[PDB]
Design a protein around this ligand. Structure first.
Ligand SMILES: [Mg+2]
Ligand SMILES: [Mg+2]
Ligand SMILES: [Mg+2]
Ligand SMILES: [Mg+2]
Ligand SMILES: [Mg+2]
Ligand SMILES: [Mg+2]
Ligand SMILES: [Mg+2]
Ligand SMILES: [Mg+2]
Ligand SMILES: [Mg+2]
Ligand SMILES: [Mg+2]
Ligand SMILES: [Mg+2]
Ligand SMILES: [Mg+2]
Ligand SMILES: [Mg+2]
Ligand SMILES: [Mg+2]
Ligand SMILES: [Mg+2]
Ligand SMILES: [Mg+2]
Ligand SMILES: [Mg+2]
Ligand SMILES: [Mg+2]
Ligand SMILES: [Mg+2]
Lengths: 539, 77, 49, 138, 200, 328, 132, 194, 101
RNA sequence: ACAGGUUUGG
RNA sequence: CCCCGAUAGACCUUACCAACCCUUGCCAAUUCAGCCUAUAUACCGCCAUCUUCAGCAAACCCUAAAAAGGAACAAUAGUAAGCACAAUCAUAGCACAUAAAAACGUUAGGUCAAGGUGUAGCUUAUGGGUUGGAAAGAAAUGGGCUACAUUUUCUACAUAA
């Protein structure tokens, strides 16, 4: 979807999120221009006459006939409500078919107006109950007024008209969301509604068993027993459950898994039983299923199961199973969280170059797990290769991530084979901050040990003198190390300035620095300077 | 692709003698209309309805102009 | 349809998507001419008035 | 290393209707330059040798259309400007093809057909006899 | 009539007539003025006559965490934006009006005695930093050719000297003034005298 | 630009590796023979100039070369004529003049000792060796050469050749000689085939002014021609057209010794005769010896007639006829 | 003297591109066609229907990308979908480039009743072939 | 703020599958091609232009998606849609004895918005008269009834129908013409006695 | 707008010819024949003459699309001989090149 | 006078 | 320059004229359109000419000073990127020929009438539509076709009647 030109290739996740919106803002703008000026696109040249490339019209066909204006205004909020008044002003009798769609057009978009239109459903004409609950029950759940919804069920039961699937798909939620120090009465009412749904010769659909399951996740942590009972009862019917059904069960198991590690095995076996067949996203609630089935693996440290979760998603459709990228960025990050340190460094590096630059950029979390993986196995040749990518992928998080990317060099040794990378990684960091960026004092201890074994003292001495002018002085262990380096390199003129710039700021190890300078001057035959420094620090 | 021509066949295009029943058979009207029928059958550009409309235009024109055919000396209906 | 061409181009230019350099040149030249003092007379006052 | 799994899912059914047979499938490819035509010939030969088509390829003669216009704007007729339009042809002669084979071959060819060339397909549809001609007596 | 329009470059080339057949030998020079004003200088791509704020050109793409819809300004701020555009049009000439001044050698409007800096280093690598140069004469020399008629060429006299007795002079003649100065500075080092100075 | 040249070498190497990978051939056996064809196939750029087509060769071939180092680190020039402008051309002139003086003194000593054991190797008529041209000398000597200097060098070479040359002097003079590009303009003779119990079988092809003719001749039968199934006398009523057929046969005395069948397409009454004549002449070479083939190709029997009709020009009548140009 | 599609010789400082540096007698010899389709063949039709749409797009893209378009367009016509290759300078932000490409792919497709592809290549400056 | 991102060349693997980078027709974006290609007429002292920003490299069609590797990879999966050709009909002698009728149908392709080509309506029907059951007088009558459409030297009748708009309608008209000719070749009317 | 008032009038001429093409096509069948008597042909002549003037395709002039030049315009490209050169020498038309033989 | 401007295609 | 714009005129073409009609009068809109009105001595775009003539030229060097010039081949201060020439390309094999190309400039050369145009002029008209005519030859002249015959004319016909 992005353009392959380097100036247009997205660098970070925010840029990738912004470029798509920018392109869509031009697409919908051109569509709006087409809709505003259809006469410039009426001419058809293509022989197959592709209708999707034709301009759309948002105006009705007839404005005088009320029955013709209602059917055009129900499909194209305020105009649909004004058409109702324009129809009722002429004393026109409206049937039970146009009123149903007129009420649905309002129940789809849209408190007082809701009641004013709901009274227009019964007071004007006896609208059919089969069209009454398809509107009012679904319109009151978003207005948070379920006390009137339960009366419509009694009304339709007294009118001897059966209740459809969409009735119970919302009434159980409406009666479950109302709880006042009681959780048993609502469950018993749900059971008594199911025993009547099975009595009224209406088979419960997949969403019927899914909606009751969606309500048992926010009320009780022990409510997984009925969640599994209905899951087995639905298997006993012969309807293969979609991903949305298992999503809520895995969500409840993830809530009950933090205190007890037993639900993880149930999650794993049910996921292994589900992953044996190719599914299809026939339910719009199949997005968080993977977000939970991989979050459990990332929380309980199961890479052998993270591999199975990754192999399950790309079985039938690698892309039609996740809707938003907010879940993808959290999904691949928590996958690489386990993949960095659990498996081999070779596997980590081979899965890095395929998912990080191509699929999605990591967050600030997995960037620390990468440092941990490169530190546990003592891998130094990959640090300059990962940092050059981090320069572009974590520039927004660099100021809160740099204090942990450079500590890996001091914990390991300094072989004489990587002395050029040891200098490049320090230069590309330090030469950019002095031209603007809080500079941590621990980076100077690293730039000292990178050049100590490298044998470059002239370039290392300037970095020590540059930071001392930043109104901040590092610890005297760095001074004692650079003093050993200077006394090994036979340059006594450099220590007489270090001791002076440390004594005026009163380092806590100044009494040891004064002992080390004496030994250095005795070794290099500078007792005159050894006494001159004492005579200078005295005053 | 995308053009079915109203699901017509060759018998609706070539064989058009079925529309010349409202004309004198032994008069010059048939001699004139056979040429129009051949031209319409040898025209892959027009559909069947347009040829029917041409035939009907000729029918109503000849049926409206009745004085000229009676004046010409040849009896036509 | 040259009328469709011109209307589409002018509508885009006025909406802020197309930038017609020739129309901008015509407008700049007309602005300079009216600033110099020789513009287009009003309809009905050219011959009589 | 991360290769997608279960990527094969076609919808191929066997209908009981006898497939149509073809004797000769002629493909006349017209273009402007010869390099594109040679690349297309190599591509077609490579696509036909895998399917077992035994394509016979020969180069039909070229056709050049030349036209003369004036050189100046108002009045200069002794001086002219002549423009030329070349058309090089390639003949792909396929023999012993079936209905499904011809369909898949023409699909794989017209999906990757270049922009600067055109292609004319002439099919020799095989048929034995209609029903009113086998042995009728008026 | 949209196909009848052309490029602004061709429009200006046909309007100013810089390549006219009369301006070759010198039959022009009557209306001695030539200015081509860029129309797209301060023309923002997003703004239009109707004032539609596109989420990608005029207004940002994201506000308050949510996307921005297609909106249009009222008829009270677009007029002020156009007034600011007219202000910038009338200020354009003020921006491109400045002559970089320098120190005067002899008079305020001459090059005699003005400083020009040390000459360029030699090809072998020697650098003349202690040398100081001065322009002594500037003259616009004309030559009558066969086609171009008057061929204005700048010839200047440039002297070099360090202050220890070694100095010289040279003449640089070219088409451009900056090129003539450079040629004179580069040729003045090759001709150096030594002046015997009693007690320096 | 040594760093640029090295970077281009590395880029060419990695691009050749990736090209072999994407083509599917072995990279070790992948060379320029495959590079050229792979590039021509992957980038089908049909142009009239091959140099304008995409080409990926070695950087040492893409970027041109120049003169090598003339002086070492000390700055002293290597050659002893570096301050002459042409350290190669003037060195060649000096060496040629030195060899000329040596040959002159050798010949003088031989004349004084009364010994004439040399010969004149200047008459190069049967060899067809011509002297070098300006391009043939500038391709050897890297630096440019002037026309007057080239003429002086050629005249010095001919001066040296006009004197009795020595043993290595002959090679020294001949190393700046270029003979005919192939020196073998003699044509090839088609072998005598035998098709379906038919001996003395031969076939020939001819063309003159858009008229293509093929002849099948049998050297065992009597003398007659079969022109498109009909007799030659009825096919060519004019005497000229029959003389065109008799001309190749009369020169070889094969009037009543060959039976021929000719098929001609295109042309008129004389173009067909000329094409059949050319085809017969090219076909009768298999029955005669080499000297008679040479005599025929010297007489013009084996050479085509490039005189075709020229295209008409704008503003003219017959590509030469101009309109009436009025002076006033 | 021929003037058609021929830029004259200046004093020696003007930058010219590979296309303008070649006289019109070099078409199909050293430089190729800027547009590829089938209407310009021998036994094919629709030569003007594609030519008018070519000129309209030549003007449309020039008006859409002002000042940032380096060279002319490359207009390929292949199987009912037309490709527009452009060499643009990286003057505009990537968000403004994506806005315009998404607006074009949805405007021109509906205006010509055929799928359009728009490919952009960002160059730092105009690539100079001859003297500059 | 200007950002310069390196192209894919520095990340291209030497063993990477090229059809994965170029599966379909592309405008030859130089950012995904690790091959340094120089196209264009060089200068007297210069070299052909580089691949970056080369207009001539975008002018020419690219076959990078049709490398032999991709050709084989695509043709391997196409073995499932095709059928087997009957080996008992390799020689045309038996093909003529089994299916004597030949049906020539023209089909054309062109890039653009229009698909309708008036040259596609023609349908040719070639029938060998030596494979039918006409008697002597029936054949002698069919010859004079078809006229010049029957080649006496080749013994083939050619019927070129273009009267119907649709190709299927022309095919039906051609088979009707063959049927009505085979039927009328046998009817001996009153005028055949003279 | 259009290119010129001449082109604007020619567009209306083509539109009226397409509008009344069927009527003239049906009436000319009554005049171009010799079987029907001339008595009705003389009336059909007056009837077809009573039609508007711009209804006959004879008034249609093949002008250019870009500049609407009345002469020197090719029928295949519908472009003037000068605009065609201005585009071909630019290279916006495939296959067009300078004829060299 | 420590001088500068002013003739001419120059 | 003179079968030139025009590879094309009964209406349209056609910008000419006479009779009559309309004046925000092609576009969404514009105290706005529209002009085949003048200026080709303001232009671009396109060309004619010398012209199958080769010269042009940034960067250096030289002159008993330099405005400028820079050459003697048995050579006396000349090197040089690129543009011209050349080579190459096309007339499906070479060579040839043809084609193509021919910079910088002269003719204030031709084109405001292919198209857009700066300046100067029209808006109940130099603008937009309908109908009818746009002859004719006292005379001169350019370029082509037919011939003024016997190597001709007619007949069938490849050329022996
Ligand atoms: Mg002053
Ligand atoms: Mg106009
Ligand atoms: Mg004087
Ligand atoms: Mg003439
Ligand atoms: Mg008229
Ligand atoms: Mg008129
Ligand atoms: Mg007028
Ligand atoms: Mg002029
Ligand atoms: Mg020369
Ligand atoms: Mg000089
Ligand atoms: Mg040079
Ligand atoms: Mg040349
Ligand atoms: Mg050749
Ligand atoms: Mg030659
Ligand atoms: Mg020429
Ligand atoms: Mg003049
Ligand atoms: Mg003149
Ligand atoms: Mg005028
Ligand atoms: Mg104009």
């Amino acid at each position: 979807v992005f353009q392959d030109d380097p100036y247009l290739i997205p660098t970070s996740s925010v840029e990738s999120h912004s470029f798509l919106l920018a392109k869509k803002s031009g697409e919908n703008a051109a569509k709006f221009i087409i809709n505003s000026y259809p006469k410039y696109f009426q001419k058809d040249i293509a022989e197959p006459h592709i209708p999707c490339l034709m301009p759309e019209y948002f105006e009705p066909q007839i404005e005088d006939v009320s029955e013709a204006a209602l059917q055009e205004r129900i499909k194209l909020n305020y105009n649909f409500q004004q058409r109702e008044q324009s129809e009722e002003l002429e004393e026109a009798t409206e049937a039970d078919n146009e009123k149903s769609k007129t009420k649905a057009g309002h129940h789809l978009g849209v408190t007082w107006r809701t009641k004013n239109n709901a009274e227009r459903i019964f007071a004007l004409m006896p609208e059919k109950n089969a069209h009454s609950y398809c509107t009012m029950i679904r319109g009151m759940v978003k207005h948070q007024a379920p006390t009137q919804a339960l009366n419509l069920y009694t009304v339709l039961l007294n009118n001897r008209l059966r209740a459809d699937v969409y009735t119970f798909n919302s009434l159980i939620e409406a009666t479950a969301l109302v709880v006042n120090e009681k959780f048993e009465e609502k469950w018993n009412n749900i059971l008594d509604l199911l025993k009547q749904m099975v009595t009224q010769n209406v088979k419960p659909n997949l969403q019927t068993f899914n909606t009751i399951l969606k309500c048992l996740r926010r009320f009780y942590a022990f409510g997984k027993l009925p969640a599994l009972q209905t899951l087995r009862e639905m298997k006993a019917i012969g309807i293969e459950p979609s991903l949305a059904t298992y999503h809520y069960v895995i969500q409840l198991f993830y809530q009950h898994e933090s205190p007890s590690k037993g639900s993880s095995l149930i999650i794993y076996d049910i996921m292994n039983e589900v992953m044996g067949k190719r599914f299809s996203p026939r339910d719009p609630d199949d997005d968080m299923f993977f977000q939970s089935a991989m979050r459990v693996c990332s929380s309980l440290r199961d890479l052998e199961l993270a591999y199975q979760v990754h192999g399950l998603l790309n079985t039938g459709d690698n892309w039609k199973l996740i809707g938003s990228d907010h879940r993808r960025n959290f999904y691949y990050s928590k996958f690489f969280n386990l993949l960095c340190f659990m498996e081999q460094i070779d596997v980590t590096l081979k899965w890095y170059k395929d998912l990080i630059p191509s699929v999605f950029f990591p967050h600030s979390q997995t960037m620390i797990d990468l440092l941990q993986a490169l530190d546990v196995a003592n891998r130094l040749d990959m640090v300059p290769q990962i940092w050059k990518d981090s320069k572009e992928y974590g520039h927004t998080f660099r100021n809160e991530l740099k204090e942990e990317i450079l500590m890996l060099m001091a914990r390991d040794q300094h072989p004489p084979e990587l002395q050029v990378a040891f200098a490049d990684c320090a230069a590309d960091i330090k030469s950019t901050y002095e031209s603007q960026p809080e500079w941590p004092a621990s980076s100077l201890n690293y730039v000292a040990v990178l050049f100590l074994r490298a044998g470059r003292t002239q370039e290392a001495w300037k970095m020590l003198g540059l930071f001392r002018k930043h109104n901040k002085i590092p610890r005297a262990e760095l001074l004692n190390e650079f003093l050993d380096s200077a006394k090994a390199s036979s340059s006594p003129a450099q220590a007489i300035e270090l001791v002076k710039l440390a004594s005026a700021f009163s380092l806590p190890v100044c009494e040891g620095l004064t002992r080390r300078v004496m030994a250095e001057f005795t070794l290099t035959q500078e007792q005159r300077e050894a006494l001159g420094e004492l005579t200078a620090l005295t005053s | 692709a995308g053009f079915d021509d109203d699901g017509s066949e060759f018998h609706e295009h070539i064989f058009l003698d079925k529309y010349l029943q409202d004309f004198p058979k032994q008069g010059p009207i048939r001699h004139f209309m056979e040429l129009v029928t051949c031209g319409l059958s040898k025209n892959p550009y027009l559909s069947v309805k347009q040829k029917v409309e041409h035939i009907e235009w000729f029918r109503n024109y000849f049926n409206e102009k009745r004085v000229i055919l009676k004046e010409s000396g040849i009896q036509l209906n | 349809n040259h009328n469709t061409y011109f209307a589409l181009m002018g509508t885009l230019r006025f909406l802020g998507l197309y930038r017609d350099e020739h129309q901008d040149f015509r407008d700049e030249q007309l602005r300079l001419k009216k600033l110099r003092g020789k513009g287009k007379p009003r309809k009905g006052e050219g011959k009589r008035a | 290393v991360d290769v997608p799994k279960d990527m094969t899912k076609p919808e191929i059914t066997i209908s009981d209707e006898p497939d149509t047979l073809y004797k000769r499938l002629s493909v006349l490819v017209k273009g402007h330059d010869k390099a594109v035509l040679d690349s297309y010939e190599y591509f077609a030969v490579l696509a036909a040798k895998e399917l077992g088509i035994s394509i016979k390829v020969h180069e039909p003669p070229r056709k050049i259309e030349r036209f003369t216009l004036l050189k100046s704007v108002h009045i200069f007729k002794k001086h002219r400007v002549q423009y030329e339009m070349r058309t090089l042809y390639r003949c792909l002669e396929l023999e012993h093809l079936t209905g499904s084979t011809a369909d898949v071959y023409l699909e794989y060819i017209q999906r990757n057909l270049p922009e600067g060339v055109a292609m004319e397909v002439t099919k020799t549809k095989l048929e034995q006899l209609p029903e009113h001609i086998r042995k009728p007596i008026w | 009539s949209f196909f009848t329009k052309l490029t602004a470059d061709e429009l200006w080339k046909g309007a100013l007539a810089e390549s006219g057949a009369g301006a070759r030998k010198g039959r022009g020079k009557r209306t001695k003025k030539k200015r081509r004003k860029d129309l797209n200088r301060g023309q923002i791509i997003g703004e239009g006559r109707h004032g539609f704020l596109w989420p990608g050109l005029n207004i940002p793409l994201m506000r308050n965490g949510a996307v921005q819809t297609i909106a249009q300004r009222s008829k009270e701020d677009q007029e002020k934006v156009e007034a600011d555009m007219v202000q910038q049009r009338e200020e354009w000439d003020r921006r491109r009006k400045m002559k970089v001044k320098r120190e005067r050698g002899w008079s305020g409007n001459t090059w005699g005695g003005v400083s020009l800096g040390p000459p360029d280093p030699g090809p072998n690598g020697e650098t003349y930093d202690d040398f100081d140069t001065r322009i002594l004469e500037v003259r616009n020399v004309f030559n009558m050719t066969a086609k171009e008629g008057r061929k204005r060429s700048v010839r200047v006299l440039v002297a070099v000297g360090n202050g220890k007795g070694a100095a010289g002079f040279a003449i640089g003649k070219a088409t451009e003034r900056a090129d003539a100065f450079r040629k004179a500075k580069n040729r003045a080092v090759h001709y150096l005298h030594y002046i015997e100075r009693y007690e320096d | 630009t040594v760093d640029f040249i090295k970077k281009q070498i590395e880029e060419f190497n990695i691009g050749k590796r990736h090209l072999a990978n994407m083509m599917g051939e072995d990279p070790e056996t992948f060379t320029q023979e495959d590079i050229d064809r792979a590039i021509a196939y992957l980038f089908p750029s049909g142009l009239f100039e091959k140099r304008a087509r995409p080409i990926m060769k070695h950087p040492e071939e893409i970027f041109p070369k120049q003169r090598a180092i003339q002086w070492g680190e000390d700055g002293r020039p290597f050659h002893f004529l570096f301050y002459t402008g042409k350290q190669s051309y003037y060195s060649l002139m000096h060496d040629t003049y030195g060899k000329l003086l040596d040959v002159e003194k050798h010949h003088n000593q031989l004349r004084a000792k009364d010994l004439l054991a040399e010969k004149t190797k200047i008459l190069k008529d049967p060899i067809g060796s011509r002297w070098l041209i300006k391009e043939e000398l500038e391709e050897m000597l890297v630096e440019k050469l002037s026309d007057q200097d080239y003429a002086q060098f050629i005249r010095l070479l001919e001066r040296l050749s006009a004197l009795p040359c020595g043993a290595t002097e002959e090679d020294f003079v001949n190393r700046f000689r270029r003979s005919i590009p192939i020196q073998s303009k003699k044509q090839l003779i088609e072998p005598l085939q035998y098709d379906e119990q038919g001996m003395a079988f031969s076939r020939g092809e001819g063309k003159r002014k858009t008229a293509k003719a093929e002849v099948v001749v049998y050297g065992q039968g009597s003398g007659r021609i079969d022109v498109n199934g009909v007799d030659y006398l009825l096919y060519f009523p004019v005497t000229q057209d029959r003389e065109q057929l008799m001309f190749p046969l009369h020169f070889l005395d094969r009037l009543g010794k060959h039976d021929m069948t000719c098929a001609v397409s295109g042309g008129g009454r004389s173009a067909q005769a000329g094409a059949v004549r050319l085809a017969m002449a090219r076909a009768l070479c298999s029955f005669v010896t080499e000297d008679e083939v040479e005599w025929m190709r010297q007489a013009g029997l084996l050479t085509a007639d490039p005189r075709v009709r020229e295209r008409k020009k704008p503003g003219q009548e017959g590509a030469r006829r101009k309109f009436t140009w009025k002076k006033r | 003297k021929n003037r058609a599609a021929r830029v004259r010789v200046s004093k020696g400082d003007k930058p010219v591109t590979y296309e303008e540096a070649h006289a019109p007698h070099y078409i199909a010899h050293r430089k190729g066609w800027l547009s590829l389709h089938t209407g310009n063949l021998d036994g094919e039709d629709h030569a003007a229907e594609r030519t008018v749409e070519d000129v309209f797009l030549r003007k449309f893209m020039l008006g859409t990308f002002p000042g940032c378009l380096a060279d002319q367009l490359v207009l390929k016509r292949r199987a009912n979908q037309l490709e527009i290759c452009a060499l643009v300078l990286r003057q505009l932000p990537p968000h403004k480039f994506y806005f315009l490409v998404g607006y074009s792919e949805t405007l021109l497709s509906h205006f010509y009743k055929c799928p359009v592809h728009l490919h952009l290549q960002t160059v730092p400056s105009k690539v100079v072939y001859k003297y500059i | 703020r200007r950002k310069a991102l390196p192209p894919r060349t520095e990340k291209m693997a030497v063993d990477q599958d090229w059809p994965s980078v170029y599966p379909v027709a592309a405008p030859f974006k130089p950012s995904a091609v690790p091959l340094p290609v120089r196209m264009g007429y060089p200068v007297k002292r210069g070299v052909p232009m580089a691949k970056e920003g080369n207009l001539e490299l975008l002018k020419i069609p690219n076959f990078l998606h049709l490398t032999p590797v991709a050709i084989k990879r695509h043709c391997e999966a196409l073995k499932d849609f095709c059928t087997e050709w009957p080996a008992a009909l390799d020689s045309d002698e038996k093909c003529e004895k089994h299916f004597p009728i030949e049906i020539d149908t023209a089909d054309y392709v062109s890039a653009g918005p229009s698909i309708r080509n008036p040259k596609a309506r023609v349908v040719t029907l070639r029938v060998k008269l030596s494979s039918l059951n006409l008697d002597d007088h029936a054949k002698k009558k069919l010859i004079k009834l078809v006229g010049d459409r029957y080649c006496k030297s080749t013994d083939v009748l050619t019927i070129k129908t273009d009267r119907c708009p649709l190709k299927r309608q022309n095919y039906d008209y051609a088979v009707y013409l063959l049927t009505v000719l085979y039927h009328e070749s046998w009817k001996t009317e009153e005028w055949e006695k003279k | 707008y259009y290119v010129d008032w001449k082109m604007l009038r020619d567009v209306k001429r083509r539109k009226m010819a397409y509008e009344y093409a069927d009527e003239r096509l049906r009436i000319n069948s009554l005049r171009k024949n010799t079987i029907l008597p001339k008595d009705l042909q003389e009336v059909a002549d007056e009837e077809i003459a009573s039609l508007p003037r711009d209804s006959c395709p004879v008034r249609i002039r093949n002008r250019c699309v870009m500049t609407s030049r009345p002469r020197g315009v090719k029928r295949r490209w519908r472009l003037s001989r000068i605009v065609f050169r201005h585009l071909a020498d630019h290279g916006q038309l495939s296959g067009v090149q300078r004829a060299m033989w």
